């Protein structure tokens, strides 16, 4: 293996192991990416699924705590977000209202933005049938699922607690990836709040060279 | 209107409101069912998107805590657990690694469950035209979340720490609707120990009456 903390495993298709990888770079964490072969259905490999019973990506190991294992991407984020951003420099603190809030917006990504981009992805592109609407049906709620981002950011400058948080960045890899899906997308005359605040993230290096990592490795 | 400790909003139909009611129930918290009608769009009125921009059933107000607001069935699930389950009787400690165990199993249900149970229920009672292999891929993947928690429940007889946590828990009203919607289907033959694990919650009285109180709202 290698020196890192973190053994981080990804399919380099997917937004949520990079996720996962902004906030580790965010928080000067040592981690090593792990790619799956999820082509040759290496996430339902037994190995993998020693790791992750679901056998989805991504998974986490943290050597620097015992080789504890953990999946589900927010909750990784979650972990190590609680656990080493003392000085709270991208999360909220554990125990205090906001952090409660934090974790709504974080699910709000998972079972909100995730569950629902990645259906409009499957019936554009992998559904065995052509179902217009289907994909319509998701078009639909990936918009609305901006105009709820929108609802907010024009009002504050983050989700949570006047900082960019874990909450915020949840959402970056999804947004990013999900244009290409929308019918002549323009996102900053669309969503113009939101769009400010995914640029605003994305620029970051801590968010630019993953993403950057991400890009070739696609190519 | 009331004087019970806390306001929450949901549908009937909907497994996510349930899920919180079972957990004030298990806690021994007083609180009071504001039904939000969802077949009126009643969700997308003024005053409730005041509470969540989202748009969406549950939502929570605790009294006890200056009127405070907060949606996302499992992250609404997490504050009280957290904030008041002082003697772990269905929690982990909040700073163990047990707790983003806990964690994880919740995204899980947040994720991996209530999206693609929720789609299966909605390609066949709700979605404009019919189509089988919609209907055919939701079942498929219901039925590939059971598989998950049966690799798990038949080694383990809790997700985790020993003990009936929020994260058993928060699996109980998806598992019980969800049944109606997947042909020829035999719990116990084709998932034992999540069969036994679910049965044995929805025992509960704490768990047993709002489920309850959800039948009948529902008649
Ligand atoms: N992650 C969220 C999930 C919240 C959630 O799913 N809320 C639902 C509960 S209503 S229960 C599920 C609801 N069903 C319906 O809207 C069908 C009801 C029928 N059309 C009628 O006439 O009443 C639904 O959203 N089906 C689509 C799907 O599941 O993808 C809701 O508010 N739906 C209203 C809306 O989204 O506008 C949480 O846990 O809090």
Not at 72 to 80: C, D, F, G, I
Not at 110 to 135: C, D, M, N, R
Not at 165 to 173: E, L, N, Q
Request: proline share 4%; no cysteine.
């Amino acid at each position: 293996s290698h020196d890192k903390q973190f053994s981080l495993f990804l399919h380099k298709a997917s937004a949520h192991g990079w996720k996962v990888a902004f906030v580790l770079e965010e928080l000067s964490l040592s981690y090593e990416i792990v790619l799956v072969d999820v082509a040759k259905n290496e996430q339902k490999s037994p190995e993998f699924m020693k790791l992750n019973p679901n056998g989805r990506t991504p998974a986490l190991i943290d050597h620097g705590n015992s080789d504890f294992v953990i999946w589900e991407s927010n909750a990784m984020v979650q972990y190590v977000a609680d656990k080493y951003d003392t000085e709270r420099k991208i999360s909220m603190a554990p125990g205090t209202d906001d952090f409660y809030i934090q974790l709504q917006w974080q699910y709000f990504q998972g079972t909100g933005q995730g569950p629902y981009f990645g259906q409009l992805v499957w019936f554009t592109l992998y559904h065995e049938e052509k179902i217009p609407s289907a994909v319509t049906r998701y078009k639909e709620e990936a918009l609305r699922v901006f105009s709820v981002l929108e609802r907010v950011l024009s009002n504050q400058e983050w989700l949570v607690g006047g900082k960019m948080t874990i909450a915020d960045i949840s959402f970056v890899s999804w947004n990013d990836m999900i244009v290409h899906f929308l019918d002549n997308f323009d996102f900053e005359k669309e969503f113009p709040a939101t769009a400010a605040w995914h640029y605003k993230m994305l620029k970051r290096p801590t968010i630019k060279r993953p993403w950057d990592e991400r890009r070739k490795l696609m190519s």
